[PDB]
């Protein structure tokens, strides 16, 4: 099963709770309502995950330090938060984009069906520039 293997590759990459010395502490890469320090931001994931034509609206957010990070890092943490509601589980690949929206109207688009392209890994992003993350993801079939 090749579709299953492609799913497993995305799951194995993005389910890791560390990257480059950062880690998911206190569920900060999943969901928090805890008060923010002056040096933190909270980026809300606002979107839909539609499975076999039924829309789900999972509520997740990521709590990060204010700093310049790489797109590899932000892509990682964002997809980790998606995995926490069920993204990349089972045997079928999702499709659709996850979009990092910036405060002045910029975007970084993360295509969900494949890994981040290697040539994008080192793009530098100030976490304080991020407005939110939107997404419209589709999994065409349920697992049987
Ligand atoms: C085969 C392959 O992977 N080739 C990639 C390019 O990806 C292909 O071409 C794209 C135009 C698109 O059709 C894609 O589906 C193809 O796989 C890749 O180009 C980037 O691809 C991503 C999506 O995977 C985005 O479309 C990106 O555009 C944007 C973005 O939305 O992310 C536009 C945006 O305005 C811009 N924002 C800023 C602030 O600069 C961002 C940003 O530059 C990047 O996200 C930072 O990485 O890009 C396409 O540029 C291309 C560059 O990675 O490499 C191969 O050619």
Residue numbers in the entry: 22 to 165
Give verbatim excerpts from the published study on this entry.
We now reveal that SElX also possesses functional characteristics of the SSLs. Here we present functional and structural evidence that SElX is an ‘SSL-like’ SAg.
The first 21 residues and the last 3 residues of the mature protein were undefined in the crystal structure, lacking electron density. The first structured residue N22 defines the start of the α-helix that sits atop the rear of the β-grasp C-terminal domain. It completely replaces the typical OB-fold domain, revealing SElX to be a unique single-domain SAg. The binding site for sLeX is a V-shaped depression in the side of the β-grasp domain, which is formed by residues from a β-strand, the opposing helix (a 310-helix), and the irregular polypeptide loop that links them.
